[PDB]
Amino acid sequence: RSKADVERYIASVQGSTPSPRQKSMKGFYFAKLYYEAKEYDLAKKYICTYINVQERDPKAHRFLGLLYELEENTDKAVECYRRSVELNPTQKDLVLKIAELLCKNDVTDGRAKYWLERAAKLFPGSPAIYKLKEQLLDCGWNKLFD
Amino acid sequence: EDRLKIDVIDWLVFDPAQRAEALKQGNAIMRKFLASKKHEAAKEVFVKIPQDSIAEIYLPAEDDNAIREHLCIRAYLEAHETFNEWFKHMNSVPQKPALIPQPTFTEKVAHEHKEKKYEMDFGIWKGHLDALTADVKEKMYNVLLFVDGGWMVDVREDAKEDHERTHQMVLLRKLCLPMLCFLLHTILHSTGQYQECLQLADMVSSERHKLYLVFSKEELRKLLQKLRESSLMLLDQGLDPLGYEIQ
Amino acid sequence: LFRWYLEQHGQLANFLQAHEHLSWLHEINSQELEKAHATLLGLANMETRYFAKKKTLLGLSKLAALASDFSEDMLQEKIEEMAEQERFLLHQETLPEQLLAEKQLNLSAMPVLTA
Structure with a gap:
């Protein structure tokens, strides 16, 4: 594909479903192809509009969080994962991610500690859990040894 | 007869060339269950709908609405x-x-x-x-303040007559919007967010949503005896009825 | 009453002390909705100190009036004279979010501005 393949499909479904609500409900499926065509400032606005009509979809919210992850916007990416997690609790891997990102960016707030506790009980003694325990401590020699 | 209906879905889902009809029918089926508040029924159907249905289907007036209705329904479920x-x-x-x-x-x-x-x-x-x-809370405001035309309200206006569905969409609003409001009030009151409780009278009366039309006169008063209750606790705290400092 | 305000059965004396601006409260309670609507609109008008609050009172007034027992004619008047109020307010309401952080303004904790 290219830029033409994806921006030409705009006129494809625009000519099939022209009302604003259905135009915005196709944003996730519009954004589905811009993520593939390496367009992240564009894909961001496409998914963000589908989120404006479909604000309760855990997949869309996570997809934006994963896109903000490529943008390295931790505060924005974390919040997106949070919404997908609070909508659907079965997304364990996202509870790790939130805990993983909260400990890497800043530990001063206890919120990073909380999400790490949950991540532990979802993955009992996994290799990543300790890694996060050491990361949180990092932010002294005797302390690490204990 | 519950199974007869929830089983006709897997037959329509099997053939990807009928995903537009599978969703539409999935909606209808979930509209009957919602009116009965069978949320485990509605959701057991909601999972049978492949998570990637919306993406593939991509638009007749009957497909633009059914995509919107489906998300409305997910917004409702997630709010329970x-x-x-x-x-x-x-x-x-x-x-x-x-x-x-x-x-x-x-x-x-x-x-x-x-x-x-x-x-x-x-x-x-x-x-x-x-x-x-x-x-x-967030979920209750996603349903109550549903983006782009209100909850269970078609955006597309060029479909062919479907009185069953249309009147099913008016009803679902009158059973579930009074009921979601009263819950959110119960959540706000239970957590002591009294100032915000009273701000349900802005959300409801709002001309932007016209939520007050979905209320029976009795339900209103009931919401008005619910807010007067939050108000009290705000007086006990020393603030005015609506939560603002008494200067 | 002025010695109760300065400071159960205290809510029966609250029922009598709610006489004055706290009116609307004992009015919703007495099932005197039409009455609650009149004073709720009256308190909305004098309101100048807090925008967020002038907005809340009208909304309440309106939900009071709608829930009350006006004839479809009277009701149509209360909601039209009302639609006006909401029409002016909506103006301060739609104030862009660029100049309200520029002017360093409080979101809700701001006054009822004039034309």
Whole structure:
């Protein structure tokens, strides 16, 4: 594909479903192809509009969080994962991610500690859990040894 | 007959060339169950709909609405999945330490500890609560303030007559929007967010949503005797009825 | 009453002390909705100190009036004279979010501005 393949499909479904609500409900499926065509400032606005009509979809919210992850916007990416997690609790891997990102960016707030506790009980003694325990401590020699 | 209907879905889902008809029919089926509040019924159907249905289908007036209706329905379900969790938690508050009047010096210390541990759990049960309150609220405002035309309200206006569906969409609004409001009021009141409780009278009366038309006159008054209750607690705190400092 | 305000059965004396601006409260309670609507609109008008609050009172007034027992004619008048109020307000309401952080303004904790 290219830029033409994806921006030409705009006129494809625009000519099939022209009302604003259905135009915005196709944003996730519009954004589905811009993520593939390496367009992240564009894909961001496409998914963000589908989120404006479909604000309760855990997949869309996570997809934006994963896109903000490529943008390295931790505060924005974390919040997106949070919404997908609070909508659907079965997304364990996202509870790790939130805990993983909260400990890497800043530990001063206890919120990073909380999400790490949950991540532990979802993955009992996994290799990543300790890694996060050491990361949180990092932010002294005797302390690490204990 | 529940199974007959929830089973006709897997037949339509099997053939990807009928995903537009599978969703549409999935909607209808879930519209009957919602009017009965069978949320495990509605959701058991909601999972049968492949998570990637919307993407592939991509638009007749009948497909633009059914895509919107489906998400509306997900917005509704998610507004009950997160409340029942929140509600389950509100009913699991750490219990006070039991008192042993006339204690031995042994029982005195076991109790100095049980009393100090409880004063750690009650802090987290407000911790977990706040995060389950922040989440259940968001969902209740996604449904009540549904983006782009209100909940269960078609955006596309060029479909062919379907009185069954259309009147099913008006009804679902009159059964579930009064019921979601009263819940959110119960969530706001339960967490002591009284100022915001009263701001349900802005949300409802709003001309932007016209939510007040979905209310029976009786339901209104009931919401007005619910708000006067939040107001009280705001007076007990020393503020005016609506939560603003008395200068 | 002025010695109760300065400071159960205290809510029966609250029922009598709610006489004055706290009116609307004991009016919703007495099932005197039409009455609650009149004073709720009256308190909305004098309102100048807090925008967020002038907005809340009208909304309440309106939900009071709608829930009350006006004839479809009277009701249509209350909601039209009302639609006006909401029409002016909506103006301060739609104030862009660029100049309100520029002017360093409080979101809600700001006054009822004039034309």
